[PDB]
Amino acid sequence: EIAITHHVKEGHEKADPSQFELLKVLGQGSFGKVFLVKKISGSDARQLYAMKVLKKATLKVRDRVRLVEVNHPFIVKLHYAFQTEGKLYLILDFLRGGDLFTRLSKEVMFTEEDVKFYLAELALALDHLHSLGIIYRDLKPENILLDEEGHIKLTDFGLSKFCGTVEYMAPEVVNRRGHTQSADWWSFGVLMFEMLTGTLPFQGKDRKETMTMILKAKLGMPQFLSPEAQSLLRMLFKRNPANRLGAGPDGVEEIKRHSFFSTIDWNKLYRREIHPPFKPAT
C-alpha cells in the first residue's frame, strides 16, 4: 500500500468531502483519476485543488517542528487529507501536465548539467520545507514530480510503500537514535548518486544489509563524475551530521556555494528563468 505522511501546519483544521465541490475529473496520466475541486469554506474557499481518492493508503499526520503562506516554485503541497468512508482523500495543488521524475530517469539519462538543474531546484524546495518546519527523513525520487514546463515539483508530503525507504535514509535516521534536518541533505546526496550514476549508493538484498551499508560501507567514488560532483558527494555523504554539508546555520547556503552549483544563478532559478533541460509534452 501507499503511505502518505502529511506535514500539517499548526492550527490547520481538518476538511470534509462536502466542503469541496467537483468541477472536472481528468486523467493526468501517471497521476491517474484526478478530481478538480474548489473549496466552499475557510481561507482557501474558492481555490481550485486537485483531489485524489485512494483506497489503500495510510495517513500519518506529522506536525512541523517550527506567519506568511507562499507558493514555492518547486514544491507541490498537500493542503488537506481526510479518511472518510474507508477511502483516503488527498487535497493537493493542481499540477497541470505534471509527470513523475522517475519516468524521465528511466527514459533519458541526465548530464551533470541536467542533474545540477534538478538538484538545484530540489535544494531550494527542501530548504523551503525545512524553513517551514518539515524534516523529510526519507526524501526519495518518488517524492519528486515535474510540472508542465519541466521544473521540479517536490511533494511537501511523505510517500512510501515509520515506513520509509531505507536506501535514502541517513545513518542517524537508520540508527533510530535521533535526527535533524541535516538527515535530509544526506538523502539529497543519495539522489545525486542515483541521478548521476543510475544506481543507488547503498543497496543490499535485504533491509538489514542495506542498513548496514549506510552505517558501515566504504564507497568507491564513481570517477566519471566531475571533480565538483565528487566533492559534493564526499561532503554530503558524511555519517556524522555535524560534519555534513548543510548542517550548519546557513543550511542550504553551504550547498548552494559548492563548486558543483557554481553555474547556477539561484535567483534566476527561483524566478523560473532558467529553462529546464527537458520540456514535457505540450
Binding site: 545513518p171 549508493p201 566504504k218 567514488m221 556524522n240
Partner: peptide, 10 residues
C-alpha cells in the same frame, strides 16, 4: 554513531 564519517574511500 562511532562510524566512519567519510563514506567514499580516500
Amino acid at each position: 554513531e562511532e562510524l566512519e564519517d567519510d563514506v567514499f574511500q580516500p
